[PDB]
Design a protein around this nucleic acid. Structure first.
Ligand SMILES: [Mg+2]
Ligand SMILES: [Mg+2]
Ligand SMILES: [Mg+2]
Ligand SMILES: [Mg+2]
Ligand SMILES: [Mg+2]
Ligand SMILES: [Mg+2]
Ligand SMILES: [Mg+2]
Ligand SMILES: [Mg+2]
Ligand SMILES: [Mg+2]
Ligand SMILES: [Mg+2]
Lengths: 88, 117, 55, 106, 14
RNA sequence: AAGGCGGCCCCCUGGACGAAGACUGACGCUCAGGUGCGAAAGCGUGGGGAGCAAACAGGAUUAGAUACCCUGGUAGUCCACGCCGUAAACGAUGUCGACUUGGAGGUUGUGCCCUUGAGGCGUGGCUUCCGGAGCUAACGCGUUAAGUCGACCGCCUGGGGA
């Protein structure tokens, strides 16, 4: 996905410590930065439908992860949607 | 009339015709003989004995240059590959090099269709 | 681990006509056999091994 | 940061212009935090088959550890220069420092 | 074969 | 994922698998409409043109040759930009999970071992051929099931008409 400095920093941004890496809010941010990384790629490479399958996998994966936090704790849900620029 | 003393035999071997051609080491041709004009037409042209007399008659037209050491370049999958080399030794030459120079494409062009019979 | 620069190893793995000997004859591993294939193709561009016996 | 092995051969009539191209290309690499690992001059070497109607090509082997800044410019100036007749770069696994089998035998 | 399939549409009598 | 994918090298990028732990805490499976991909032929616009080659030209063949065979040859095959969305698109087997004697191997890892050799001993991922029980109309399948079961979806109801 990204490098070691880009991955481990965002875990420290949204996690409580360095060990808080398996939580759902980190997993949203791992997909949020990756889709934002691939904005200029698929604009130049519209004929790459095979990497688009990996793109649509991560969009569908992020949608399933937002539905779990929304059905359990809406206080943490409303924080992250504006903190990463979601809901469009 | 001229002395080269170094022969190169680009001999051809197709399924229909075998062509014996003597040349030098620098591309300048010295003589040729085909199996079509050697008294062999059609099915008789596609015989290994036709290649036995084509190499001998082409050799009789290149002894004016005094060639003793020649090179054999075999080109093609056609029959008569053995009958044309023994005919060069039957003409009084010192055989030195034999080399298969058959062109092999690296799937460059598309081959033609099948011949179903 | 394998490398294209040691051409003495590559001379033992080709023919006189520059053809690549498969792993059936030499009995080498299939892990190196894909690596030995691309290592010759590196040396084929750098004019270290001839393509055919024609030239 | 990537690890590159850069192979380029020089036209044999300009074999004295080779140490000029060694240090002019190096100063652009090392200024932008580019490391270097191997720099071996081999001299003339017999070809397995002729290229560009020539024989006895000059060979220079390199290893450059540098980011993607130099990989844009150096491949274009190889195609821009007429002395370099063949250019070839490749990505390696690690920064390596080991003599070639050509130097160890010659 | 599935009972949950026949909730949407029953078996078509000819 | 499938149709498929093959000179080399660079750049961007997708998934798969293994080892050691840490971490979230059922976040899962499945899918009617909907969405996208999707062999080749063909279509629209503009390039490109070797070789091969519908239609067609010519010559043999023949009762006639329309086909076969041979000499040529346009569209098309190539690229960009779209559209078309059908195939014997087949493993003729929808997906997921759980178990049930096993071999010949291949591929890809990893752990330990007089390293006493690229070996010995284990142990996961993928894959082919045999074959027991069992199943099956037979053919055959048979730890990758077409064995025993669960979860959900599609589809079939004599042939022809179609
Ligand atoms: Mg990856
Ligand atoms: Mg806990
Ligand atoms: Mg049209
Ligand atoms: Mg035709
Ligand atoms: Mg067209
Ligand atoms: Mg159909
Ligand atoms: Mg079958
Ligand atoms: Mg039995
Ligand atoms: Mg069986
Ligand atoms: Mg009916």
């Amino acid at each position: 996905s990204l490098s070691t400095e880009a991955t481990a920093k965002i875990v420290s941004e949204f996690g409580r410590d360095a060990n808080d890496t398996g939580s759902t809010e980190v997993q949203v941010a791992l997909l949020t930065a990756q889709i934002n990384h691939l904005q200029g790629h698929f604009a130049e490479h519209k004929k790459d439908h095979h990497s688009r399958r990996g793109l649509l996998r991560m969009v569908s994966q992020r949608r399933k992860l937002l539905d779990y936090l929304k059905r359990k704790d809406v206080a943490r849900y409303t924080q992250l949607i504006e903190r990463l620029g979601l809901r469009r | 009339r001229k002395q080269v003393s170094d022969g190169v035999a680009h001999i051809h071997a197709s399924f229909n015709n075998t062509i014996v051609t003597i040349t030098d080491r620098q591309g300048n041709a010295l003589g040729w003989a085909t199996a079509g004009g050697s008294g062999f037409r059609g099915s008789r042209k596609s015989t290994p004995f036709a290649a036995q007399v084509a190499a001998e008659r082409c050799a009789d037209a290149v002894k004016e240059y005094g060639i003793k050491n020649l090179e054999v370049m075999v080109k093609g999958p056609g029959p008569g590959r053995e009958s044309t080399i023994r005919a060069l030794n039957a003409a009084g030459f010192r055989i030195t090099n034999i080399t298969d120079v058959t062109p092999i494409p690296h799937n460059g062009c598309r081959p033609p269709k099948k011949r179903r019979v | 681990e394998i490398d294209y620069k040691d051409i003495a190893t590559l001379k033992n793995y080709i023919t006189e006509s520059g053809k690549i000997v498969p792993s059936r004859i030499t009995g080498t591993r299939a892990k190196y056999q894909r690596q030995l294939a691309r290592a010759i193709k590196r040396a084929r561009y750098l004019s270290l091994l001839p393509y055919t016996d024609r030239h | 940061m990537r690890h590159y092995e850069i192979v380029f051969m020089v036209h044999p009539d300009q074999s004295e212009q080779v140490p000029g191209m060694i240090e002019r290309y190096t100063a652009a690499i090392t200024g932008a935090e580019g490391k270097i690992h191997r720099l071996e001059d081999w001299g003339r070497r017999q070809l397995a088959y002729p290229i560009n109607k020539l024989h006895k090509a000059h060979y220079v082997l390199m290893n450059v550890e540098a980011p993607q800044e130099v990989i844009d410019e150096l491949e274009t100036t190889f195609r821009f220069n007429d002395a370099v007749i063949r250019s070839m770069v490749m990505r390696t696994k690690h920064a390596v420092t080991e003599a070639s089998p050509m130097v160890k035998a010659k | 074969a599935t009972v949950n399939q026949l909730v949407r549409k029953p078996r078509a009598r000819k």
